[PDB]
Each structure stands twice: as structure tokens, then as C-alpha cells.
Amino acid sequence: QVEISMAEWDVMNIIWDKKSVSANEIVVEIQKYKEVSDKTIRTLITRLYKKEIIKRYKSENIYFYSSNIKEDDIKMKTAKTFLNKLYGGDMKSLVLNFAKNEELNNKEIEELRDILNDISKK
Amino acid sequence: QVEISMAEWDVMNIIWDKKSVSANEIVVEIQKYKEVSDKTIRTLITRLYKKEIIKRYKSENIYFYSSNIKEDDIKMKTAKTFLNKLYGGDMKSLVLNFAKNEELNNKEIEELRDILNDISKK
């Protein structure tokens, strides 16, 4: 149980960044870097709140929201489902789809290669 | 922006495979491996239809659905979104998050290191 949609993820990225944050601030931020209207943001917040994925307290009559889920855990679960469905659960398939579409430049390919070498055992 | 949720992607996997398919047959295929109702699946099909990711014709009071989208293009768009939202646009972060969670074993890491080595120079 517990799933977070890609649209909800925009709200979660704001929340996980702050100790607590108002719905207005969430709305502002999503808009500072993307589309998404006030109405849809609020709907996202309410859904997440109703599912207890986030929590809130009220101070001087304002609601301030905080995460109620471990970011690392739901990320892994969500990514795993993603990889399974789109890439047969194969990391190489995703990475290759990216190279072939020029979504990884030469230096990014080398940096990534270096990283993988670093955590390799051979 | 055209987007397909993970729940909608299960439907697309069937429309992409069969090329032209009834709702009833979509329902039959998804319920083999998921515990969602036929009502939930019709909702996904209606949503995809509205977003014009799929198209339809009608025969004997049943609609028959086909793709109105290139799998590879939307797959890549969905993947970039996913990388952006969960991993800050950084493939190295996706890979390290999987490795730390043991979702990428030593063999897969070495192989990937080779693929990337090959793609690049040295």
C-alpha cells in the first residue's frame, strides 16, 4: 500500500525540503519551476494529507505540512515499479535508452562509468 | 503535457502488444496479475482516451482501442520526468540509490560499467 503519483511528487519534493511548509508556499514553489495551477496543487495536497503521507499542524490559524513518510523508502519502491514496467527491471536497458537518445553526454557517460568502477568489486 | 501514470501504463502495455483490442480483453489481461476491478480499468481506459493517447472505433456496442502514441517516445519522456523528480535529473543518483538498496548486484554493476566504458572512449 501507499503510492505517490508523479504529480504528487512535486508536492513531496517541497515538503521533504522543509521542516514544515504552508499550502501557499508549496503552490508558489511548484510554480517557480513548472506549470501546475493552485487548484490542482491543493487537490494534490489534500489527497496526500487524506492518505496520511503528509501530516499537518495549525499555527495562528495556518496549516503547516510535514512529511509523514520516509523519502528513501517510497522512492526505491516507486523506482523499482518504474524499472520493472518500462525496462523489464533492467538498469542497463534504462541507461542504454538514455545514451541512444543523446540524454547522456560524453562526460556524463564517463562520470557514470567512473562511479560504477568505484563501487565494483572487480 | 502528455503523461501516462504507472496504472495507465499497464493498459498501454496491452494496447501496444495487441494493437487493436476490446475493453473487455484489456480487462481480462490486467486482471490476470492485478486485483483491480473492471470499473477501475475502464476508468484508466477512459482517461487515456480523453488524453488522446489512444483512439477507438465501435462494433456491436463495444469499443475497440488502439494506440495514438509512439511507445518509445513516451517511454523516454516518462523516464526523463521520473529521473528529474526522484533523482534531480542525475543518472548517477539513480544508480547509487539502487546500489545502496541492493537493487543492483555486483554482476549488474560490472556489466553496466562495461556498457558505459564501451559507449565512450576510455
Short mmCIF file of N, CA and C in Angstrom, two decimals, chain A residues 109-122, chain B residues 92 95-96 99 104 106 108-117 122:
data_model
loop_
_atom_site.label_atom_id
_atom_site.label_comp_id
_atom_site.label_asym_id
_atom_site.label_seq_id
_atom_site.Cartn_x
_atom_site.Cartn_y
_atom_site.Cartn_z
N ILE A 109 28.63 10.13 -19.34
CA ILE A 109 28.87 8.70 -19.54
C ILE A 109 30.15 8.22 -18.85
N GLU A 110 31.17 9.07 -18.90
CA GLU A 110 32.43 8.77 -18.24
C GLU A 110 32.33 8.89 -16.74
N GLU A 111 31.70 9.98 -16.25
CA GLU A 111 31.49 10.15 -14.82
C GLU A 111 30.73 8.94 -14.26
N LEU A 112 29.72 8.49 -14.99
CA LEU A 112 28.91 7.35 -14.53
C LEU A 112 29.74 6.07 -14.57
N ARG A 113 30.52 5.92 -15.63
CA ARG A 113 31.39 4.77 -15.74
C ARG A 113 32.34 4.74 -14.54
N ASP A 114 32.98 5.88 -14.26
CA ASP A 114 33.87 6.02 -13.09
C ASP A 114 33.19 5.66 -11.78
N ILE A 115 31.96 6.13 -11.59
CA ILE A 115 31.21 5.80 -10.38
C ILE A 115 31.02 4.28 -10.27
N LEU A 116 30.65 3.65 -11.38
CA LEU A 116 30.39 2.22 -11.34
C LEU A 116 31.65 1.43 -11.09
N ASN A 117 32.75 1.89 -11.67
CA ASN A 117 34.05 1.31 -11.37
C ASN A 117 34.34 1.41 -9.87
N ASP A 118 34.10 2.57 -9.28
CA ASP A 118 34.35 2.79 -7.86
C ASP A 118 33.59 1.84 -6.92
N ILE A 119 32.36 1.46 -7.26
CA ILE A 119 31.62 0.56 -6.40
C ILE A 119 31.68 -0.92 -6.86
N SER A 120 32.40 -1.18 -7.96
CA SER A 120 32.64 -2.55 -8.45
C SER A 120 33.56 -3.27 -7.49
N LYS A 121 33.49 -4.59 -7.50
CA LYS A 121 34.46 -5.37 -6.75
C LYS A 121 35.62 -5.87 -7.63
N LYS A 122 35.51 -5.63 -8.95
CA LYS A 122 36.50 -6.07 -9.94
C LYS A 122 36.30 -5.32 -11.26
N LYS B 92 23.46 9.29 -12.13
CA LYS B 92 24.40 8.71 -11.16
C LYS B 92 23.71 8.53 -9.81
N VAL B 95 21.43 5.35 -10.11
CA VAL B 95 22.28 4.17 -9.96
C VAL B 95 22.77 3.95 -8.51
N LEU B 96 23.24 5.00 -7.84
CA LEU B 96 23.77 4.85 -6.47
C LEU B 96 22.66 4.51 -5.47
N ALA B 99 22.08 0.79 -5.94
CA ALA B 99 23.18 0.01 -5.41
C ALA B 99 23.16 -0.05 -3.88
N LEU B 104 20.78 -3.60 -7.18
CA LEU B 104 21.69 -3.72 -8.30
C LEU B 104 22.87 -4.50 -7.76
N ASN B 106 26.50 -6.92 -7.74
CA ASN B 106 27.85 -6.73 -8.24
C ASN B 106 28.01 -7.10 -9.72
N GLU B 108 25.58 -7.01 -12.21
CA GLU B 108 24.93 -5.91 -12.94
C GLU B 108 25.72 -4.60 -12.96
N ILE B 109 26.44 -4.34 -11.89
CA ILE B 109 27.25 -3.12 -11.78
C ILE B 109 28.45 -3.19 -12.72
N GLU B 110 29.12 -4.34 -12.70
CA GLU B 110 30.29 -4.56 -13.56
C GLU B 110 29.92 -4.53 -15.04
N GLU B 111 28.84 -5.25 -15.39
CA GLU B 111 28.32 -5.23 -16.74
C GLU B 111 28.02 -3.79 -17.17
N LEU B 112 27.24 -3.07 -16.36
CA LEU B 112 26.93 -1.70 -16.71
C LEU B 112 28.20 -0.85 -16.89
N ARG B 113 29.15 -1.02 -15.98
CA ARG B 113 30.40 -0.31 -16.12
C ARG B 113 30.98 -0.59 -17.53
N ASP B 114 30.93 -1.85 -17.98
CA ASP B 114 31.43 -2.23 -19.32
C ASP B 114 30.65 -1.59 -20.48
N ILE B 115 29.33 -1.57 -20.36
CA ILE B 115 28.48 -0.99 -21.39
C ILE B 115 28.90 0.50 -21.58
N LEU B 116 29.00 1.23 -20.48
CA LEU B 116 29.34 2.64 -20.50
C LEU B 116 30.77 2.89 -20.95
N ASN B 117 31.68 2.06 -20.48
CA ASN B 117 33.04 2.08 -21.00
C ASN B 117 33.04 1.97 -22.53
N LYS B 122 37.56 6.09 -23.21
CA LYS B 122 38.24 5.42 -22.11
C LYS B 122 38.55 6.51 -21.06
#
